Short mmCIF file of C-alpha atoms in Angstrom, two decimals:
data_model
loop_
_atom_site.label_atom_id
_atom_site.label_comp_id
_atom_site.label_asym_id
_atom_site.label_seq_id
_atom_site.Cartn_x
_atom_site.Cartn_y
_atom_site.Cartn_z
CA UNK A 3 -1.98 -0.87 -25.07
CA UNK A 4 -0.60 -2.56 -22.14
CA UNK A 5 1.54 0.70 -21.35
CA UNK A 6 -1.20 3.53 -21.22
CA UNK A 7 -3.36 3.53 -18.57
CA UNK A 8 -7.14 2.65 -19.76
CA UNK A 9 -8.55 5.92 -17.46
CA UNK A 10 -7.30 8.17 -14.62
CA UNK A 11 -9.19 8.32 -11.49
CA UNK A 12 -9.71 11.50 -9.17
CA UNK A 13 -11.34 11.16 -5.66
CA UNK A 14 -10.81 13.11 -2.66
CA UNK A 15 -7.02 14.09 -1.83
CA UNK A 16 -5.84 11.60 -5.12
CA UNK A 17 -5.45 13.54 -8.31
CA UNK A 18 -5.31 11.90 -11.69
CA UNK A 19 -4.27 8.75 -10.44
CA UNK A 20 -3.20 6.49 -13.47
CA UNK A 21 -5.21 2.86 -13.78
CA UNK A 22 -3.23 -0.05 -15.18
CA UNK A 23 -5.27 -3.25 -16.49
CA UNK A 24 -3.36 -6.83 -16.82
CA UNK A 25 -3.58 -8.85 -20.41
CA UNK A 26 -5.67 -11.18 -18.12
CA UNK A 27 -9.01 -11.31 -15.88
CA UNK A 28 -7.92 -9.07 -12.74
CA UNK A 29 -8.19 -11.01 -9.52
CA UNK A 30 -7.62 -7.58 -7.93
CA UNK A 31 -6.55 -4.19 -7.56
CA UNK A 32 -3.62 -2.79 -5.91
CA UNK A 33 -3.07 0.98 -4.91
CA UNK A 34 0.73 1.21 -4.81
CA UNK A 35 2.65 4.53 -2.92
CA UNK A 36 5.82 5.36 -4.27
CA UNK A 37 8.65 6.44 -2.29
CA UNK A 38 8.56 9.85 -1.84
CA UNK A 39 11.51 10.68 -4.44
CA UNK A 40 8.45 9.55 -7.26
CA UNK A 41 8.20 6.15 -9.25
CA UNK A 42 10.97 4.78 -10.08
CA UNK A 43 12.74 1.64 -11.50
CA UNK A 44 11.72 -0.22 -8.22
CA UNK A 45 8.17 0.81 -8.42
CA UNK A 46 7.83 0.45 -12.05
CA UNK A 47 9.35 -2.91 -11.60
CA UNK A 48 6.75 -3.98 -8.88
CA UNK A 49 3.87 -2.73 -10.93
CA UNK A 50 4.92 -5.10 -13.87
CA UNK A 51 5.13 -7.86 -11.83
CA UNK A 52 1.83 -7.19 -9.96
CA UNK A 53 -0.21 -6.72 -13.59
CA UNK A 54 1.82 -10.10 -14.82
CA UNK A 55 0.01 -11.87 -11.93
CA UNK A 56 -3.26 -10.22 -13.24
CA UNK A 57 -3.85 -7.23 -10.35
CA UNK A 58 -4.70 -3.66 -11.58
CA UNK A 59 -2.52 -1.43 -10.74
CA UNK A 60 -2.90 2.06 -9.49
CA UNK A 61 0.87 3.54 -8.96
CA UNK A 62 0.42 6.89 -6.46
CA UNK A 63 3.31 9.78 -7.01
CA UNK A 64 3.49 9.87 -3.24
CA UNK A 65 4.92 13.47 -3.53
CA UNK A 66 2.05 15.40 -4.56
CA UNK A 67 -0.32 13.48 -2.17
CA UNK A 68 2.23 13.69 0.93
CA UNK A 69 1.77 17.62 0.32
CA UNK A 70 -1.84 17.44 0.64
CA UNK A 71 -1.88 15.56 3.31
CA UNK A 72 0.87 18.09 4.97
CA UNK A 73 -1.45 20.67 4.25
CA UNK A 74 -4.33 19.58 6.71
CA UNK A 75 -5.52 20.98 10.14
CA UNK A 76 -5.31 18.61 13.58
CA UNK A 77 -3.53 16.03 14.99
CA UNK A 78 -3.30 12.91 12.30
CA UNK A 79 -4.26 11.91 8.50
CA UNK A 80 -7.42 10.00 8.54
CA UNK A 81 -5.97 8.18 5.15
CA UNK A 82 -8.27 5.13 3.81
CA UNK A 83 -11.33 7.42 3.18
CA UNK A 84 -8.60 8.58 -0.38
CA UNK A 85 -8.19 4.46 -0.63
CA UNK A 86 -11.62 3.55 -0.41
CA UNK A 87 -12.76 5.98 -2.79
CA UNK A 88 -10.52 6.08 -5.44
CA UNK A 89 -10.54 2.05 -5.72
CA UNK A 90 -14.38 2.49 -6.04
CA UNK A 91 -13.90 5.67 -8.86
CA UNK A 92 -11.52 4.05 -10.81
CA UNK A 93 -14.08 0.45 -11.00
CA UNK A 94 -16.72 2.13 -11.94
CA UNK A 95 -14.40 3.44 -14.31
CA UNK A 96 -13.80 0.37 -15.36
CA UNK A 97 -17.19 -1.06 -15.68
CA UNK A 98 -15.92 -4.81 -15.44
CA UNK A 99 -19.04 -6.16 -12.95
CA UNK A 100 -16.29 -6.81 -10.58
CA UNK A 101 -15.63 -5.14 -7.52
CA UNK A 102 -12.42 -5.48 -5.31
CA UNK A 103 -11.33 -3.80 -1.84
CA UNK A 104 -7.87 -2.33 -3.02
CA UNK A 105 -4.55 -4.38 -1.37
CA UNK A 106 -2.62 -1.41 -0.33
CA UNK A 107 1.01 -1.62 -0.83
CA UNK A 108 4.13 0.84 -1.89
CA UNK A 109 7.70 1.02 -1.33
CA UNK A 110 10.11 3.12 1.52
CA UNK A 111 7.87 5.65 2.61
CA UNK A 112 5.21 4.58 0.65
CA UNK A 113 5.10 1.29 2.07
CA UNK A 114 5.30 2.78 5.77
CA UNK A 115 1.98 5.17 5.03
CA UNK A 116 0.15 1.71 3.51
CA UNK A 117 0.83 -0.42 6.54
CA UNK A 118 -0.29 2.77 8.81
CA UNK A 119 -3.48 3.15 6.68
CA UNK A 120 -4.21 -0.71 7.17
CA UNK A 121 -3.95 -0.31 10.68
CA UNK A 122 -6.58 2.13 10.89
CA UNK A 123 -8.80 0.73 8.43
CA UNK A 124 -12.63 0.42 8.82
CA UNK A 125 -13.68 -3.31 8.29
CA UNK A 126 -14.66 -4.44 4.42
CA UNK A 127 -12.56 -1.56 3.25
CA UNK A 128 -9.68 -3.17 2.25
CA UNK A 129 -7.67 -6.13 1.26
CA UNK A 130 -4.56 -5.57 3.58
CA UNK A 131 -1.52 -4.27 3.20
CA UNK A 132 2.30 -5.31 2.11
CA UNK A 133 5.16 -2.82 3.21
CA UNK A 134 8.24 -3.35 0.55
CA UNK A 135 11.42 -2.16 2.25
CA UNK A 136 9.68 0.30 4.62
CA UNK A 137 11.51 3.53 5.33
CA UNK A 138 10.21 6.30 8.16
CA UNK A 139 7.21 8.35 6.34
CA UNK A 140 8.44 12.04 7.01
CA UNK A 141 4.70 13.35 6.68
CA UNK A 142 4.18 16.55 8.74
CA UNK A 143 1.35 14.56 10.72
CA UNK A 144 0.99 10.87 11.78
CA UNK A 145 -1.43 8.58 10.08
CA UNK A 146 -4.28 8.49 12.55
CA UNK A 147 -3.81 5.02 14.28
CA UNK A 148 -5.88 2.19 16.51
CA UNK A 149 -3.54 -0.01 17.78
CA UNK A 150 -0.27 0.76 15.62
CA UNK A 151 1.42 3.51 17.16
CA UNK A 152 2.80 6.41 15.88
CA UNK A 153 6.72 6.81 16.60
CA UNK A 154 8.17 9.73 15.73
CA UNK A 155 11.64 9.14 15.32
CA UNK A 156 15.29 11.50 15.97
CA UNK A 157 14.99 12.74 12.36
CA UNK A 158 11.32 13.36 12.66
CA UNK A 159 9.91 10.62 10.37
CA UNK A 160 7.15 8.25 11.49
CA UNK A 161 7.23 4.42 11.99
CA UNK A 162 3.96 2.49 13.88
CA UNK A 163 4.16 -0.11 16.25
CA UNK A 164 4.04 -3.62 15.09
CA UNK A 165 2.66 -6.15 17.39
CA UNK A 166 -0.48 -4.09 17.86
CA UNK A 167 -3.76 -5.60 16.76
CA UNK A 168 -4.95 -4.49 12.94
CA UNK A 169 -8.45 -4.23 11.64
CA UNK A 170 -6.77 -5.72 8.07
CA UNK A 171 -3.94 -8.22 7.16
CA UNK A 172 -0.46 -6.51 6.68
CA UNK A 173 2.91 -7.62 6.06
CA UNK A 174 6.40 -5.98 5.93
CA UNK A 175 9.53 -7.44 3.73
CA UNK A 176 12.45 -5.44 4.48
CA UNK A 177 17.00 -6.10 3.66
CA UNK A 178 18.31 -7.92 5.66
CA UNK A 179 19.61 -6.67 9.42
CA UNK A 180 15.71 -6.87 9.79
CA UNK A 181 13.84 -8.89 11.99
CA UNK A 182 11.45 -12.10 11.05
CA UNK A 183 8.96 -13.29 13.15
CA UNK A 184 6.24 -16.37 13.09
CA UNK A 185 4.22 -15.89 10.16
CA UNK A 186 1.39 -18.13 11.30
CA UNK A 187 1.09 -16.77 14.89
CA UNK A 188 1.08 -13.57 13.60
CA UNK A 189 -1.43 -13.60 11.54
CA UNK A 190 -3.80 -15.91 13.99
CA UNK A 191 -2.82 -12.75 16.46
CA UNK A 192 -3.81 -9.90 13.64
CA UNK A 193 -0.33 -8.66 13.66
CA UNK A 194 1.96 -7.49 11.32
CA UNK A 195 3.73 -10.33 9.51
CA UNK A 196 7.82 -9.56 9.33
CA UNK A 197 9.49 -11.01 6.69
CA UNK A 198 13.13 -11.11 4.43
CA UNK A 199 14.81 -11.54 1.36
CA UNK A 200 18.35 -10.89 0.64
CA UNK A 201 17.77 -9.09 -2.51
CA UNK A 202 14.91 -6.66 -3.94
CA UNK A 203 14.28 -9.32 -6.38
CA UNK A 204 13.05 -11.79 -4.00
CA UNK A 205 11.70 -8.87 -1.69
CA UNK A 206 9.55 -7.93 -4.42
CA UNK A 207 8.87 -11.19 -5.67
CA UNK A 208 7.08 -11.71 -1.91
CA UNK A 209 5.45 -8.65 -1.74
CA UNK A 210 3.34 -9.87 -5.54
CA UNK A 211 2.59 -13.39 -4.11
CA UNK A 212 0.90 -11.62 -1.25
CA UNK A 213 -0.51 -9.16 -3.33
CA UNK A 214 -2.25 -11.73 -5.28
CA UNK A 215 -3.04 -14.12 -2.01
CA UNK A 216 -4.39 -11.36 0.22
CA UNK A 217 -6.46 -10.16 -3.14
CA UNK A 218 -7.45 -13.57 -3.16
CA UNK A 219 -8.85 -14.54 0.61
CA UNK A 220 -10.83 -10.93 -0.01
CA UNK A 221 -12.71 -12.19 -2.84
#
């Protein structure tokens, strides 16, 4: 049953998180944040695409998480250590003898909190990250950061620094109005890749290839 999710996986601040498997081998496993309003058409239109290219799929409601995460003492989230563990709950859930470091991705705010958790990300941890149409995260704390700065914005919402140094490979497709810089300098630099598409449809057709490619060079 392609539609029902073969388990649910629970590990740290992530509750009941649903696990999608492709009709294929997975070449692996993406955790992907909704924007805060919930998954939607958008999301559930990403997901399809990323199981149709043979990723596993585990969509995040980000608005019962974002609460959580609200709910802590001190000055940042400390985010991958929910990443890390529920990719490794929800494969041995799986029991496939494969293993994968989870590509973190999401869209609006979603996508903001996966490029922030890439940027503070502990090596062999994860795949990297890709940001569709990032949107300021309006968590009540920053994502603790290295390099990727925390900006909180005139309404209050968060944005990081690009051009800072990451631990893990990320890249951001936004509308256009947006800038675009050198993808191959950026990544020889360890910066966030910016990228374009006129419409979601090829947005979110070049988040999945990098899905997929950034699943790939982890493997």
């Amino acid at each position: 049953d392609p539609f029902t999710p073969v388990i649910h996986a629970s590990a740290e601040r992530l509750s009941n998180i649903p696990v999608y498997m492709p009709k294929g081998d997975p070449v692996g496993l993406a955790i992907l944040l909704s924007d805060e309003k919930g998954i939607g058409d958008q999301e559930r239109s990403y997901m399809d695409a990323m199981l149709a290219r043979n990723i596993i799929v585990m969509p995040v409601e980000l608005g019962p998480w974002r609460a959580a995460l609200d709910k802590e003492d001190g000055e940042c989230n400390y985010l991958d250590s929910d990443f890390e563990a529920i990719a490794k709950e929800a494969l041995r859930g799986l029991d496939l003898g494969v293993y994968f470091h989870p590509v973190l991705t999401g869209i609006g705010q979603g996508a903001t909190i996966a490029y922030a958790a890439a940027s503070d990300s502990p090596d062999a941890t994860i795949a990297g990250a890709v940001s569709l149409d990032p949107t300021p995260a309006r968590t009540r704390l920053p994502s603790c950061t290295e390099k990727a700065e925390a900006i909180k914005g005139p309404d209050g919402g968060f944005t990081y620094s690009v051009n800072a140094a990451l631990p893990a490979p990320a890249l951001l497709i936004s509308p256009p109005g947006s800038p675009v810089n050198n993808p191959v300098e950026a990544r020889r630099k360890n910066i966030a890749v910016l990228q374009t598409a006129p419409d979601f449809s090829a947005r979110m057709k070049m988040a999945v290839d990098n899905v997929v490619a950034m699943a790939d060079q982890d493997a």
